[PDB]
């Protein structure tokens, strides 16, 4: 379901030779870097990284970092991190400094699996002073902080069996926690949307629509505002259709005269080996133009080339 897969006939020491020749000497051969790194799975880029340092006793990442610049550099460095460590540094930068990149925290914590999130916690603690949870608490507050802490446990019910008796009970509780009352009990939404299984919550959304005649997402928009609202919707959307969710975030990152380059880079890189094919399909059905098309119009240069290389893949 991804666009980038293992390149066949693989030799990392040779790809390291390709990259050395592309950087050695005056000037830079940006096309050879893209043809190589962009056409290798992430695990293969790690072998290349180890072969590069073995052969020449230089740090590949350090050399690319000084050889390249701009958003083309950022895409390459993002490609060179492992899926877990790329997630780890994206969360760090989102919390870094003043302000918060809540959308990034939401995008990651709402889409990744239990197993992956458990690995984020270990990696975040290993790499940084704080734990993932302590990092969250510092930068978020209210019921939104609880939402991220809940998702950051990687403990969603992994069952696929649905009990309609409990589905209907969950629907009634959601109706009572928001739409059918003055005010909102955000905690009831949190516990149901974060702890219940995906097969269970999909049935809840369909049953909730049947009984109330309204989609759960509209109740959320009616009951909640701010980051808590965007968080809940992201969770529901990912439970429904994770590809369609990312396709929408991509579309919002490009529409306008400007571009959300951090988001654009993160999504293309982070989903390239998971479901970027499905994203592309969802993108075409929802907006008419292809994801490939909108990228060419919003980016340029080597930055666009590597992005499109990821879109097409292999
Ligand atoms: Ca050079
Ligand atoms: Ca209400
Ligand atoms: Ca609202």
Author numbering: 189 to 502
What sentences appear in the manuscript?
The annexin (Anx) family of Ca2+-binding proteins is widely distributed in eukaryotes, with twelve Anxs found in vertebrates. The Anxs are structurally distinct from the EF-hand and C2-domain Ca2+-binding proteins. They reversibly bind negatively charged lipids in a Ca2+-dependent manner, which is a defining feature of this protein family.
As is typical for the Anxs, all Ca2+ binding sites are on one face of the molecule, promoting calcium-dependent lipid membrane binding. The substantial difference in thermal stability induced by the four N-terminal residues of the Δ188AnxA11 construct implies an important structural element at this position. The 4-residue segment forms conserved interactions with the ends of helices in domain IV. The crystal structure of AnxA11 presents trimers very similar to those formed by AnxA5, and hence, could be expected to interact with membranes in a similar manner. Interestingly, three of these mutations involve a buried Arg residue, and a close look at the alignment reveals that these Arg residues are fully conserved in all rat Anxs.
